[PDB]
Ligand binder design. Structure first.
Ligand SMILES: NC(=O)c1ccc[n+]([C@@H]2O[C@H](COP(=O)([O-])OP(=O)(O)OC[C@H]3O[C@@H](n4cnc5c(N)ncnc54)[C@H](O)[C@@H]3O)[C@@H](O)[C@H]2O)c1
Ligand SMILES: NC(=O)c1ccc[n+]([C@@H]2O[C@H](COP(=O)([O-])OP(=O)(O)OC[C@H]3O[C@@H](n4cnc5c(N)ncnc54)[C@H](O)[C@@H]3O)[C@@H](O)[C@H]2O)c1
Ligand SMILES: [Cl-]
Ligand SMILES: [Cl-]
Ligand SMILES: [Cl-]
Ligand SMILES: [Cl-]
Ligand SMILES: [Zn+2]
Ligand SMILES: [Zn+2]
Lengths: 385, 384
């Protein structure tokens, strides 16, 4: 029926050493001065200087905003926007995971669309008339794929909720997908962000708006990620490079079609508790998959198959169970906590979390139409055994 | 050498103890508080438990809510400026160890301005004046920071936690009220409760231990081991027991010291911003095993009050049983088993171990640790 749109990065560089392309890209574009948007951890760890050392050798000017925090808030966006406005910069370089990537998008959008100074009013299909300030995006987790999506997610601390901004105008001009930038994640962070990448690919494979091209991207991403994540957590170089590619491929799909109830149930955790996005999604994933199983056609057979299960001869019910179990197994293998209680959730908040999840935009993509009671029940199931 | 005890001159205990605050303020003649706290406690309504009572009583207050876990030199300086501009004449610390310690730093520097750099307070701070008076209200069970003479600040430039020790920082009044603590999520109850256990076990076996602190610590171990599972489960009376036990532990350890658990946790906090309670909880049983031969009969006592039938056990057996009872508690309340699980990197172990070797807490440890012993302990705790 309806035609399907795809927004993608016009330019992207892939592989260990891809950040070495940045200075030429800047020179080709004629930009005069960057604002780097990042967090203090990435500065302390030397990750930012991997980029600035190259800029300095090429004679390219920059300034830094390093105030991003996980689950970046309206306060963070306003602070970074002020730094941008006083910096003399003409473009942005986002160095970090989803939290810096998203902050950078917000800054770049508001700078060219000042009617959105309050930040909150960007939620939804932001009616921006101008493209963002140009962004060069450098992910350091594997990851959110925020370098390739048209979305960014802000935490409204005053309202205790996360909100999603969807806007073609925010797409980065160039993405640099370089596992050298990602290797310093602690193993536990690799694990959570990697199962989050898997969640993007699984939810995107089964989302209501799925179509042929996104299905092809998502099923490839699932195969890459499921084959690489244990090795990446273990520190294998090639597995890290595979994770960097797979996490990105997932975004090429889900940006354009949507996610589901895993992300919808994780957003309130981020808002209520400041839970890390990756861990929250990882813990919820297999429970939501079980819930969705009967509403997914043949797709769990494909998921199980590319996660290593010999599905030949299984009934559809068996293949569905096998897909779920393969996710539980991966979570155990890479040390994801088994229960939400383990990561600071309170049972008393489940009613309110569930209403927030029901209302979350990601939930609308879920292949099964969730009810309040389904979400209450899933939180209890995930909370403790 | 005679042994010194510093304690709170005044303290109120039990559910509802914060109800005593407004009268304590009136009796002391203070004019205006600065509340030192964090944004979570404001959001959760915990601060309002206090400020609503103050408002009813006509008592003035302002808030500094910028404390973060593992408070930094930057936080201390920010809060000090807020204090200096607030018109306050006393401090109310509402929170866990992070706000309690920030509050102590503020109150000390306000009356001892030559320590404006913060770092210069490390060790036996040579302050001439008492802190601005502090009324301390813990909201975790917990650090016992309300009753110790210590506070712990993170130097981000030097990537290290440092301990400031000073009789001048003791709070004037502590209010130990489990109603203030009940909102901790279960996982936070678990980690802060095993941290309280750690304080009591390390204090029991520390080099400076003597009769009075031994009596306090073994009672605290009994209380905490008996209550923690129930408190994590939300039982009301268990929460009140935890509030008391965590404080009794501090009555001891403030005055004698801790050991290598705390010494190995400090660099985690500095390197990774690891929560103090979780770090200590994961390390505790491994360090206990390392220390066992240097602990006399005390692991028999620990095992007994943790519910082990030690009658008939050899000392070796009783020691192993104490270690296992701690492993069991950690499983039972959901403490992660390994440091890798909480974001530690193996590549950092050499540097973590040097930092732990040099940490002040390590000097109280009953076994004299070496660099190589600490490296091995990190590796042992890092993964199965
Ligand atoms: N824009 C989108 O389409 C999109 C999609 C998914 C998620 N998100 C958002 O992304 C955010 C989560 O991002 P995330 O999971 O990448 O984590 P993050 O950016 O919040 O980072 C988490 C932590 O890991 C640290 N870290 C990151 N890279 C590191 C490295 N290389 N070395 C050491 N430490 C490193 C950070 O400093 C931080 O402390 C959430 O707010 C989520 O809502 C956005
Ligand atoms: N002698 C001493 O002064 C002493 C002793 C031990 C530890 N410490 C220090 O204490 C700090 C750790 O303190 P902590 O373990 O109490 O944790 P914390 O104060 O760092 O708080 C941890 C988290 O729990 C939240 N929290 C606290 N109370 C809550 C409540 N009632 N409801 C909901 N959330 C709540 C906080 O907002 C914060 O996000 C460390 O920096 C450590 O070095 C000091
Ligand atoms: Cl998200
Ligand atoms: Cl989230
Ligand atoms: Cl401490
Ligand atoms: Cl610590
Ligand atoms: Zn995600
Ligand atoms: Zn402690």
């Amino acid at each position: 029926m309806m035609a399907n749109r795809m927004i993608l990065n016009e330019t992207a560089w892939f592989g260990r050493g891809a950040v070495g392309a940045l200075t030429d890209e800047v020179k080709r574009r004629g930009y005069q001065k960057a604002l780097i948007v990042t967090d203090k951890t990435l500065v302390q760890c030397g990750v930012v200087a991997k980029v600035t050392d190259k800029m300095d050798a090429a004679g390219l000017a920059w300034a830094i905003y390093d105030g991003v925090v996980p689950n970046p808030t309206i306060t963070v966006v306003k602070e970074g926007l002020g730094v941008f406005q006083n910096s003399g910069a003409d473009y942005l370089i986002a160095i970090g995971g989803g939290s810096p990537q998203d902050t950078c998008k917000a800054i770049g959008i508001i700078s060219n669309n000042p009617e959105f100074a309050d930040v909150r009013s960007l939620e939804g299909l932001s009616p921006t008339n101008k493209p963002s300030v140009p962004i060069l995006a450098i992910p350091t987790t594997a990851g959110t794929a925020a370098e390739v999506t048209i979305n960014y997610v802000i935490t409204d601390e005053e309202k205790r909720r996360k909100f999603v901004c969807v806007d073609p105008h925010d797409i980065p001009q160039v993405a640099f997908i370089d596992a050298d930038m990602m290797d310093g994640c602690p193993p536990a962070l690799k694990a959570a962000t990697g199962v989050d990448a898997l969640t993007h690919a699984i939810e995107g494979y089964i989302t209501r708006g799925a179509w042929a091209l996104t299905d092809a991207l998502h099923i490839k991403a699932i195969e890459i990620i499921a084959g690489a994540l244990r090795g990446s957590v273990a520190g294998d170089k090639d597995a890290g490079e595979e994770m960097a590619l797979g996490q990105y491929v997932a975004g090429m799909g889900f940006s354009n079609v949507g996610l589901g109830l895993v992300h919808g149930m994780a957003h309130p955790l981020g808002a209520f508790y400041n839970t890390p996005h990756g861990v929250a999604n990882a813990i919820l994933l297999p429970h939501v998959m079980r819930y969705n199983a009967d509403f997914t056609g043949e797709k769990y057979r494909d998921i199980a198959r590319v996660m290593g299960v010999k599905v030949e001869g299984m009934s559809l019910e068996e293949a569905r169970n096998a897909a779920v179990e393969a996710v539980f197994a991966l979570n155990r293998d890479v040390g994801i906590p088994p229960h939400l209680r383990d990561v600071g959730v309170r049972k008393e908040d489940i009613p309110a979390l569930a209403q927030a999840a029901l209302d979350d935009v990601c939930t609308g993509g879920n292949p099964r139409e969730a009810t309040l009671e389904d979400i209450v029940e899933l939180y209890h199931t995930a909370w403790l055994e």
